[PDB]
Amino acid sequence: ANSVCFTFTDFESGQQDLIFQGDASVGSNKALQLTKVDSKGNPQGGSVGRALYTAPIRLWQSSSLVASFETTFTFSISQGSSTPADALTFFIASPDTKIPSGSGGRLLGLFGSSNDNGVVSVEFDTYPNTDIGDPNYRHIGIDVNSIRSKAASKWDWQNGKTATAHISYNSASKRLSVVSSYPNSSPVVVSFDVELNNVXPXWVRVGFSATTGQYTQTNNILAWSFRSSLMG
Amino acid sequence: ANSVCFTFTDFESGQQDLIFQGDASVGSNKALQLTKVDSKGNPQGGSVGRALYTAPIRLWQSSSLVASFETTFTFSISQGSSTPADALTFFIASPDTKIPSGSGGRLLGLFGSSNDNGVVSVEFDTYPNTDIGDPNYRHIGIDVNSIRSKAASKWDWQNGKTATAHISYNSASKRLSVVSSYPNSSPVVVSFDVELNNVXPXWVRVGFSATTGQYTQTNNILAWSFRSSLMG
Amino acid sequence: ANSVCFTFTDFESGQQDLIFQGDASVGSNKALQLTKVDSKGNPQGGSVGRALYTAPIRLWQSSSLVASFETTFTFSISQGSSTPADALTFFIASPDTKIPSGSGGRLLGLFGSSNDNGVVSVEFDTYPNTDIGDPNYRHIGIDVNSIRSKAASKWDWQNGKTATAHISYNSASKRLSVVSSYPNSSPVVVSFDVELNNVXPXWVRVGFSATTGQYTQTNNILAWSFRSSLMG
Amino acid sequence: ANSVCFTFTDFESGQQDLIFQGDASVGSNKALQLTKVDSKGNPQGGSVGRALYTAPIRLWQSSSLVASFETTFTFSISQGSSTPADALTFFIASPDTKIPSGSGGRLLGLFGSSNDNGVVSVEFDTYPNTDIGDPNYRHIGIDVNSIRSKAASKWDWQNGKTATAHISYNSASKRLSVVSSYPNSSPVVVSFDVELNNVXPXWVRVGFSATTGQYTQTNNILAWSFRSSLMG
Numbered sequence: 043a044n045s046v047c048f049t050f051t052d053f054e055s056g057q058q059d060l061i062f063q064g065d066a067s068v069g070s071n072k073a074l075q076l077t078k079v080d081s082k083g084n085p086q087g088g089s090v091g092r093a094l095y096t097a098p099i100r101l102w103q104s105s106s107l108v109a110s111f112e113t114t115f116t117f118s119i120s121q122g123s124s125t126p127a128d129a130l131t132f133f134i135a136s137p138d139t140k141i142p143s144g145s146g147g148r149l150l151g152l153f154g155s156s157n158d159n160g161v162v163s164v165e166f167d168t169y170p171n172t173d174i175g176d177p178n179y180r181h182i183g184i185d186v187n188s189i190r191s192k193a194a195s196k197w198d199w200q201n202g203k204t205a206t207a208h209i210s211y212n213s214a215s216k217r218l219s220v221v222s223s224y225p226n227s228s229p230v231v232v233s234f235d236v237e238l239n240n241v242x243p244x245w246v247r248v249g250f251s252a253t254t255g256q257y258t259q260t261n262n263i264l265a266w267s268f269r270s271s272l273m274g
Numbered sequence: 275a276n277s278v279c280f281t282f283t284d285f286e287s288g289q290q291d292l293i294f295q296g297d298a299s300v301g302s303n304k305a306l307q308l309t310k311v312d313s314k315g316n317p318q319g320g321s322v323g324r325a326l327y328t329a330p331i332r333l334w335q336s337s338s339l340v341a342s343f344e345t346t347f348t349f350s351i352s353q354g355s356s357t358p359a360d361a362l363t364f365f366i367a368s369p370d371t372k373i374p375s376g377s378g379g380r381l382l383g384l385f386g387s388s389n390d391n392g393v394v395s396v397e398f399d400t401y402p403n404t405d406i407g408d409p410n411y412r413h414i415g416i417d418v419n420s421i422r423s424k425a426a427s428k429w430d431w432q433n434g435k436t437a438t439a440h441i442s443y444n445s446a447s448k449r450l451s452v453v454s455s456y457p458n459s460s461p462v463v464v465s466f467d468v469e470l471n472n473v474x475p476x477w478v479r480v481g482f483s484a485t486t487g488q489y490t491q492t493n494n495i496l497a498w499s500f501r502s503s504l505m506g
Numbered sequence: 507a508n509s510v511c512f513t514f515t516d517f518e519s520g521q522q523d524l525i526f527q528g529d530a531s532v533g534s535n536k537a538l539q540l541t542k543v544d545s546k547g548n549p550q551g552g553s554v555g556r557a558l559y560t561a562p563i564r565l566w567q568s569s570s571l572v573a574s575f576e577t578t579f580t581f582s583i584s585q586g587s588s589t590p591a592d593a594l595t596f597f598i599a600s601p602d603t604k605i606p607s608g609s610g611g612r613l614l615g616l617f618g619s620s621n622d623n624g625v626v627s628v629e630f631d632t633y634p635n636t637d638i639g640d641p642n643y644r645h646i647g648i649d650v651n652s653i654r655s656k657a658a659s660k661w662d663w664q665n666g667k668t669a670t671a672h673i674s675y676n677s678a679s680k681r682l683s684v685v686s687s688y689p690n691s692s693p694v695v696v697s698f699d700v701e702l703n704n705v706x707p708x709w710v711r712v713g714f715s716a717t718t719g720q721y722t723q724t725n726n727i728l729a730w731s732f733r734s735s736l737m738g
Numbered sequence: 739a740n741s742v743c744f745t746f747t748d749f750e751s752g753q754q755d756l757i758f759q760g761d762a763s764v765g766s767n768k769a770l771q772l773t774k775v776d777s778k779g780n781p782q783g784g785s786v787g788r789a790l791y792t793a794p795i796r797l798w799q800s801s802s803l804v805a806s807f808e809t810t811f812t813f814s815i816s817q818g819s820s821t822p823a824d825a826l827t828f829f830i831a832s833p834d835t836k837i838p839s840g841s842g843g844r845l846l847g848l849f850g851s852s853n854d855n856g857v858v859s860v861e862f863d864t865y866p867n868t869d870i871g872d873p874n875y876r877h878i879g880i881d882v883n884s885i886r887s888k889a890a891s892k893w894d895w896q897n898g899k900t901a902t903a904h905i906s907y908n909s910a911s912k913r914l915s916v917v918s919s920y921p922n923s924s925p926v927v928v929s930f931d932v933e934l935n936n937v938x939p940x941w942v943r944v945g946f947s948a949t950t951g952q953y954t955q956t957n958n959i960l961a962w963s964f965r966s967s968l969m970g
């Protein structure tokens with residue numbers, strides 16, 4: 043479509059307009075639980091889950107004057123183990139994208155390696171994996187075809203509290219930016235200059251991905267709005 | 275989703291965010307050709323085709339204060355034979371809706387009979403089939419679970435010209451209305467009091483359906499915008 | 507404009523995009539206090555106030571296929587005296603509309619009499635004034651050029667609680683409807699068949715009006731969104 | 739307001755939701771003629787005119803997570819004299835902004851000098867005034883408190899043809915970008931990194947400005963849509 047927008051104030055079990063992958067599901071709390079949480083509410087380890095809006099989105103078209111999208115979502119991350127892991131992220135990929143093999147834990151279910159098939163995402167990393175590029179502290183990062191963020195900023199994750207994140211991009215400015223914050227707190231912003239049409243196909247699907255590894259945490263999306271438009 | 279909107283200014287072959295049924299396809303003209311048109315541009319008889327937005331839409335929710343939707347679309351109908359047939363329509367049905375068996379010609383591919391599984395549609399009827407309720411003239415009608423329109427008005431179809439139609443409804447007014455017109459012409463309006471949640475499931479898919487029978491015509495959708503919202 | 511939409515999640519003192527009339531102002535609570543409330547927070551009697559969006563709105567145009575608008579707002583009404591009065595309302599009038607002389611108390615600041623200059627409003631009446639048509643109980647009503655509601659329904663006002671109201675209309679259905687409710691409560695709906703272009707000018711201004719008389723209550727608008735569109 | 743959007747597909751004489759300054763008016767062609775055009779349709783010299791949306795817009799708020807706006811408009815510039823002058827522009831300024839004294843011709847009615855009261859605009863310059871910074875060719879530029887563009891690109895203006903321009907900005911990316919083009923042509927883009935809240939007040943009014951000097955041209959806005967939102 044030339045333009046598309048949708049808003050989820052909450053979710054229900056089986057949410058018909060979402061494609062669920064891995065362990066992703068909707069809990070009795072009406073939250074999108076990307077990763078596994080048991081009956082007692084304890085997040086499980088070695089979990090991976092993703093959810094995508096059912097309809098493919100036309101993110102770019104050569105004949106268009108400008109293309110843009112923006113998405114805002116709220117999420118809660120509560121540690122299970124004394125220390126949280128691994129993270130959640132908003133991502134954009136080909137319509138037929140699926141959880142890559144071996145993408146667990148530190149790969150956030152986005153990539154099958156720690157090195158037409160492009161992957162762009164904004165990660166909210168709760169566990170520093172320094173041997174693969176992670177700064178030694180929690181952070182938010184912009185990943186383009188690699189778990190190794192092209193840009194990242196220290197992020198003061200708050201256990202259990204609801205965070206609000208806003209992601210934006212248009213083909214004129216060619217800059218992907220994300221701003222995230224908690225109530226009564228200082229926001230964190232991350233930006234990266236990139237022309238998405240050079241790393242992503244014309245058609246994509248958008249959503250979230252998350253994982254736990256040895257360490258755990260809930261990765262719940264509470265609300266989500268998305269908008270994309272192609273102007274000609 | 276609590277709200278969803280999309281806009282198609284035109285279409286392309288294989289339009290990824292549309293579900294094609296029957297003969298429906300997109301032509302080199304970038305129009306959604308619901309029914310079959312040959313290489314020379316001649317509409318074929320005995321054709322049936324429908325197209326639905328890929329994502330299911332939450333049209334109602336008990337907890338909502340009000341639910342509404344509106345859609346505007348442009349379409350062109352050019353006769354193949356000296357007299358046009360059969361018609362096209364905007365419709366709403368269950369997500370897994372499929373072309374009913376024996377729904378050709380006068381049934382507009384919407385119903386399998388000329389008498390959870392509800393069907394609501396606004397038909398743009400170009401061929402009067404009087405033995406099944408059609409007034410003896412072209413008309414626009416609102417159908418609820420039956421090809422026999424609950425409400426209809428004379429429609430002065432214009433061969434080949436681009437028509438504009440607007441359909442609206444909200445659960446407060448409980449009135450489905452459609453207004454359609456051609457440039458430099460007098461619009462036609464049709465309304466019917468109905469509470470959609472009593473004839474349609476919570477989740478549906480929306481789109482178009484069209485057919486030709488013994489007589490033919492093109493049934494092309496040129497542009498289409500749709501919006502639905504659930505307020506709580 | 508052919509279409510216009512605005513959203514107020516809250517308000518500030520002097521709200522630059524609002525026209526204040528009478529006692530209307532914004533409190534430290536960030537709420538639009540239509541009627542006077544003293545330093546201690548006690549609503550004052552004999553008060554009248556209205557607030558309008560600064561920009562005139564084109565509600566109708568002869569060349570348009572269809573015209574529609576919808577507005578949603580939250581409001582709180584807390585009695586000052588043992589019994590509340592008088593009410594608040596959403597209204598539409600000419601751009602240069604002003605508080606009519608003698609419109610206090612039971613006239614809700616909308617009309618100068620209890621009998622191009624049209625006035626359409628949805629009143630939330632907290633004090634039954636039976637000698638002028640009010641049913642003997644609190645209600646919501648649709649007024650067209652008269653304080654005597656053309657349509658009304660019993661309304662179970664709840665002291666202090668935040669109510670949510672949704673008002674809608676389009677020129678195809680020609681039915682003005684309002685649905686209002688409190689959390690964990692049963693909504694109330696009021697509808698009236700009317701073709702607004704026959705009682706209102708093409709251009710108008712929209713907003714709220716409220717009053718207290720012998721008896722008092724706060725008349726606070728907490729949030730407000732409005733949308734209007736003319737399709738051609 | 740926290741968010742506001744409006745769309746003008748065309749204009750009428752006296753357009754009630756616009757503030758007209760200088761020579762700005764609406765012609766029989768339904769176009770916003772920023773500068774003077776006589777009865778015969780000949781653009782007049784030494785003209786200056788501006789038009790602003792009547793309602794003030796809240797472009798920034800300290801408590802907001804992110805602030806953004808985007809506007810798209812079509813315009814036609816037909817030379818009167820053998821060579822066109824001077825230009826038109828989209829601009830943002832304080833709500834009470836007025837045509838500065840001595841802002842004619844090369845100053846595009848935006849500044850009173852060729853060197854809380856900030857002025858940000860995107861100029862479409864049809865006449866190179868090299869002694870004041872203009873590159874020696876037609877161009878589009880981003881001006882911040884000065885007629886001397888902070889960023890500019892060569893612009894292949896086409897006499898009489900309808901151009902389409904899209905301007906965007908959000909407080910996360912902190913980059914103001916404009917893309918403009920004619921049908922069947924190569925677009926031109928101009929971007930400048932700037933944090934608008936450091937050069938503009940919280941509240942502003944938005945619109946267009948244009949002028950002719952010794953040389954002339956029409957400066958007609960044919961359509962205009964604007965959107966701004968503050969997310970918290």
Ligand SMILES: OC[C@H]1O[C@H](O[C@H]2[C@@H](O)[C@H](O)[C@@H](CO)O[C@@H]2O)[C@@H](O)[C@@H](O)[C@@H]1O
Binds near residue numbers: 146148256257
């Ligand atoms: O969920 C955390 C982490 O768990 C697993 O990695 C463990 C160990 O192998 C690593 O060397 C250290 C690095 O500090 O972290 C854990 O102790 C993996 O599942 C990994 O993907 C994940 O990030």
Ligand SMILES: OC[C@H]1O[C@H](O[C@H]2[C@@H](O)[C@H](O)[C@@H](CO)O[C@@H]2O)[C@@H](O)[C@@H](O)[C@@H]1O
Binds near residue numbers: 360381402486487
């Ligand atoms: O496409 C027109 C029409 O064609 C076929 O019906 C024909 C005949 O059987 C009917 O009695 C008359 C009624 O006037 O119409 C045609 O001549 C069928 O395919 C029918 O569904 C369709 O409407």
Ligand SMILES: OC[C@H]1O[C@H](O[C@H]2[C@@H](O)[C@H](O)[C@@H](CO)O[C@@H]2O)[C@@H](O)[C@@H](O)[C@@H]1O
Binds near residue numbers: 591610612613634719
């Ligand atoms: O604010 C309530 C009411 O107060 C005043 O009217 C009083 C009296 O004159 C009326 O007869 C009775 C009717 O029950 O109500 C009050 O006691 C007026 O200001 C009136 O406009 C207002 O509704």
Ligand SMILES: OC[C@H]1O[C@H](O[C@H]2[C@@H](O)[C@H](O)[C@@H](CO)O[C@@H]2O)[C@@H](O)[C@@H](O)[C@@H]1O
Binds near residue numbers: 954
């Ligand atoms: O509208 C064009 C231009 O006209 C006037 O300037 C003239 C002259 O004074 C300048 O030196 C040359 C520079 O090439 O241009 C004109 O001939 C002024 O009104 C000026 O503001 C304007 O741009």
Ligand SMILES: [Ca+2]
Binds near residue numbers: 128148167168169170
């Ligand atoms: Ca990590």
Ligand SMILES: [Ca+2]
Binds near residue numbers: 361
């Ligand atoms: Ca028929």
Ligand SMILES: [Ca+2]
Binds near residue numbers: 592631632634635
């Ligand atoms: Ca009363």
Ligand SMILES: [Ca+2]
Binds near residue numbers: 824872
């Ligand atoms: Ca110049």
Ligand SMILES: [Mn+2]
Binds near residue numbers: 165
């Ligand atoms: Mn990381």
Ligand SMILES: [Mn+2]
Binds near residue numbers: 421423
């Ligand atoms: Mn029929």
Ligand SMILES: [Mn+2]
Binds near residue numbers: 653
């Ligand atoms: Mn009353």
Ligand SMILES: [Mn+2]
Binds near residue numbers: 863873885
């Ligand atoms: Mn210049």
